[PDB]
Design a protein around this motif. Structure first.
Motif, short mmCIF file in Angstrom:
data_model
loop_
_atom_site.label_atom_id
_atom_site.label_comp_id
_atom_site.label_asym_id
_atom_site.label_seq_id
_atom_site.Cartn_x
_atom_site.Cartn_y
_atom_site.Cartn_z
N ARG B 96 0.82 -1.21 0.00
CA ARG B 96 0.00 0.00 0.00
C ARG B 96 0.85 1.26 0.00
N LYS B 97 2.08 1.18 0.51
CA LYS B 97 2.96 2.33 0.64
C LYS B 97 4.38 1.83 0.81
N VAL B 98 5.33 2.78 0.80
CA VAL B 98 6.74 2.49 1.04
C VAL B 98 7.28 3.60 1.92
N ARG B 99 8.34 3.28 2.67
CA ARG B 99 8.86 4.21 3.66
C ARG B 99 10.37 4.36 3.49
N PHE B 100 10.83 5.61 3.53
CA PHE B 100 12.25 5.94 3.53
C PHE B 100 12.54 6.82 4.74
N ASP B 101 13.61 6.50 5.47
CA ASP B 101 14.10 7.37 6.53
C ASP B 101 15.12 8.32 5.93
N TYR B 102 14.75 9.59 5.79
CA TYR B 102 15.59 10.57 5.11
C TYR B 102 16.38 11.40 6.12
N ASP B 103 17.70 11.45 5.92
CA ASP B 103 18.59 12.24 6.76
C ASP B 103 18.54 13.70 6.30
N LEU B 104 17.82 14.54 7.03
CA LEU B 104 17.77 15.97 6.73
C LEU B 104 18.86 16.67 7.54
N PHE B 105 20.08 16.63 7.02
CA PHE B 105 21.21 17.23 7.71
C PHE B 105 21.45 18.66 7.21
N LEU B 106 21.98 19.49 8.10
CA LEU B 106 22.27 20.89 7.82
C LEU B 106 23.76 21.14 7.97
N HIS B 107 24.29 22.06 7.17
CA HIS B 107 25.70 22.39 7.21
C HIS B 107 25.95 23.68 7.97
N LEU B 108 27.21 23.89 8.34
CA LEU B 108 27.59 24.97 9.23
C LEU B 108 27.65 26.31 8.50
N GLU B 109 27.63 27.38 9.30
CA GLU B 109 27.85 28.72 8.80
C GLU B 109 29.20 28.82 8.11
N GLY B 110 29.24 29.51 6.97
CA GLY B 110 30.45 29.68 6.21
C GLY B 110 30.70 28.62 5.16
N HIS B 111 30.08 27.45 5.29
CA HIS B 111 30.22 26.34 4.37
C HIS B 111 29.13 26.39 3.30
N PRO B 112 29.31 25.67 2.19
CA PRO B 112 28.30 25.69 1.12
C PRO B 112 26.96 25.20 1.62
N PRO B 113 25.87 25.56 0.96
CA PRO B 113 24.56 25.01 1.33
C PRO B 113 24.47 23.54 0.98
N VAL B 114 23.67 22.81 1.76
CA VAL B 114 23.45 21.40 1.48
C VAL B 114 22.66 21.26 0.19
N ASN B 115 23.12 20.38 -0.69
CA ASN B 115 22.34 19.95 -1.85
C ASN B 115 22.58 18.46 -2.01
N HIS B 116 21.58 17.66 -1.66
CA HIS B 116 21.73 16.22 -1.56
C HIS B 116 20.66 15.54 -2.40
N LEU B 117 21.04 14.46 -3.07
CA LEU B 117 20.12 13.67 -3.88
C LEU B 117 20.27 12.20 -3.52
N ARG B 118 19.15 11.52 -3.34
CA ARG B 118 19.11 10.10 -3.01
C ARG B 118 18.23 9.41 -4.04
N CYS B 119 18.82 8.48 -4.79
CA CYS B 119 18.11 7.75 -5.83
C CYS B 119 17.61 6.42 -5.26
N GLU B 120 16.32 6.16 -5.43
CA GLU B 120 15.71 4.94 -4.94
C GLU B 120 14.97 4.24 -6.07
N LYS B 121 15.14 2.93 -6.15
CA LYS B 121 14.49 2.10 -7.15
C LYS B 121 13.46 1.21 -6.47
N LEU B 122 12.23 1.25 -6.97
CA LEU B 122 11.14 0.42 -6.47
C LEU B 122 10.85 -0.69 -7.46
#
Lengths: 8, 138
Positions: B96-122
């Motif tokens: 009926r559904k699928v579940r992913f535990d997604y790590d929403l991590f943040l980076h420190l001041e002065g460092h680049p912004p987070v840009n993250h991609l996770r590819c999942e195959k069903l």
């Protein structure tokens, strides 16, 4: 790299 | 039955997170956006009924339901957390559904912004004909 604190 | 089939669909989860140059009055140091999508901007709505983002308990209204694309949540905050994401399918049968535990991590001041991609195959082994035609429209 280094990351912020977490909600914990 | 003589024949059987396995249908495969690709999902893309990801998030961006950027340090604000001034925190809000609440102390929110970051603006972030998390999303669930298909690749090549393919139409995953053909088989996705909704996407539920379960935010950390500290947020107000932590259950964020997206019934239409784009499947995304935009928020400000001060810390990373594990974000369970439920993708409900247009399917009376199981799964009926699928579940992913997604790590929403943040980076420190002065460092680049987070840009993250996770590819999942069903993979769906022998779906019903009605669910199969939706999966193949995507």
């Amino acid at each position: 790299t280094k990351q912020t604190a977490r909600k914990s | 039955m003589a024949s059987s089939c396995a249908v495969q669909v690709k999902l893309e989860l990801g998030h961006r997170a950027q340090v604000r140059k001034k925190p809000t009055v609440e102390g929110f140091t970051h603006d972030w956006m998390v999303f669930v999508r298909g690749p090549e901007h393919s139409n995953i709505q053909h088989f996705v009924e909704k996407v539920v983002f379960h935010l950390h308990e500290s947020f107000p209204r932590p259950k964020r339901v997206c019934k239409d694309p784009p499947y995304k949540v935009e928020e400000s905050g001060y810390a990373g957390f594990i974000l369970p994401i439920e993708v409900y399918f247009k399917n009376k049968e199981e799964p009926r559904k699928v579940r992913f535990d997604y790590d929403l991590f943040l980076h420190l001041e002065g460092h680049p912004p987070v840009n993250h991609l996770r590819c999942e195959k069903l993979t769906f082994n022998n779906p019903t004909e009605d669910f199969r035609r939706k999966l193949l429209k995507a």
